[PDB]
């Protein structure tokens, strides 16, 4: 249930970088009429967050992630915003909000960014060309594009073999061992029964 800003031009996004409130008066009035009149502003707009602040943010991320998976090449943030809104309707308002969602995906390796090549660090810092983003069909354990991921895995694979044989040569176990800890108690048994009941219903 998206809500429009007092300018009636876009929807407000659930993040700390949003500086516009949601219009909630029963009647539609221009901003200039009531903003300078001196009346309390809370009578016209809601400056707070919704009760489902965390759940809405998670839903928006899934919409962005699914759209990227349907794409076949990296695209800009502007294209992502237009594509999501066209498919589902006016649910996202700004490109900064989408960028924040993408940063979370990049941190956890759910997406990747293609960066340009620059001759000097200062040119890279001052560059203003938009970036391109892609998505991984499944979560990976390495950063970068699929070509970069393959290179990183190859280095990791070599290191693992190097370490395992060095341990064997120095009279250590090739593979570390642990003990199995029991993590199934009476609480877990009752959770499983609850899960079956919900699934049946």
């Amino acid at each position: 249930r998206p809500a429009l800003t007092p300018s009636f031009s876009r929807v407000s996004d659930p993040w700390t970088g949003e500086k516009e409130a949601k219009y909630a008066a029963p009647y539609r009035i221009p901003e200039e009429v009531w903003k300078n009149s001196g009346a309390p502003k809370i009578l016209f707009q809601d400056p707070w967050n919704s009760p489902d602040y965390d759940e809405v943010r998670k839903k928006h991320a899934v919409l962005v992630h699914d759209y990227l998976k349907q794409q076949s090449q990296p695209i800009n943030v502007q294209t992502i915003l237009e594509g999501v809104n066209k498919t589902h309707g006016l649910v996202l308002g700004t490109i900064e909000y989408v960028t924040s969602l993408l940063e979370n995906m990049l941190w956890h390796d759910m997406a990747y960014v293609v960066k340009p090549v620059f001759s000097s660090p200062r040119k890279a810092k001052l560059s203003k060309i938009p970036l391109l983003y892609g998505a991984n069909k499944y979560q990976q354990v390495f950063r970068g594009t699929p070509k970069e991921v393959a290179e990183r895995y190859e280095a990791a694979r070599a290191k693992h073999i190097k370490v395992a044989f060095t341990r064997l040569r120095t009279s250590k176990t090739p593979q570390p061992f642990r003990r199995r800890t029991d993590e199934y108690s009476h609480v877990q048994a009752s959770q499983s029964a609850l899960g079956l009941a919900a699934a049946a219903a």
Binding site: K19, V33, W34, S37, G38, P40, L43, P47, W48
Partner: protein
């Protein structure tokens, strides 16, 4: 009045490091909104009075930016909802001075000074506060002076919806 010090902002040190100092003042400010009257030491009361006045100013603003700042100060959702809805309408016309401080002697054990901090317009108030808008006699020098210096002086409480907003709604409907 509250003394001004040399540190950034001119606040009290409350005998604490800055990190612990901010955690304490936020908690007490939350309790002041919930209960509206608290008894504590003089130094914590002086700091709370000045900090409390600036927290009410954010509530009166009623903007997205103001709410974000307040959301980092208040500790409970119920207290934050009250600040923007109930207290915002209560102090529409009052220009400053939303909190009062009265000294109450010394404690028993360590003989520390104490005081009481309270809001200045409500049921259960210690005293009766002056009206938010001061009435002006019709044949006084004060009325003539205000006309010459501030033609937009406010003499009586204003309605929630001013005539311009009411007229627009009537024309629309």
């Amino acid at each position: 009045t509250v003394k001004r010090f040399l540190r950034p902002g001119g606040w009290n040190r409350l005998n604490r490091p800055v990190k612990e100092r901010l955690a304490l003042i936020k908690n007490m400010a939350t309790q002041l909104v919930e209960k509206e009257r608290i008894r504590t030491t003089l130094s914590k009361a002086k700091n709370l009075q000045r900090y409390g006045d600036k927290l009410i100013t954010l509530g009166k603003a009623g903007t997205r930016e103001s709410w974000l700042k307040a959301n980092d100060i208040v500790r409970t959702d119920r207290e934050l909802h009250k600040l923007f809805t109930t207290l915002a309408l209560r102090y529409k016309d009052r220009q400053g001075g939303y909190v009062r401080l009265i000294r109450a002697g010394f404690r028993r054990g360590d003989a520390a000074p104490v005081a009481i901090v309270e809001l200045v317009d409500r049921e259960g108030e210690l005293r009766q506060a002056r009206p938010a808008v001061t009435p002006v006699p019709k044949f006084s020098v004060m009325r003539w002076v205000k006309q010459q210096l501030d033609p937009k002086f406010i003499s009586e409480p204003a309605p929630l919806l001013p005539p311009l907003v009411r007229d627009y709604l009537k024309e629309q409907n």
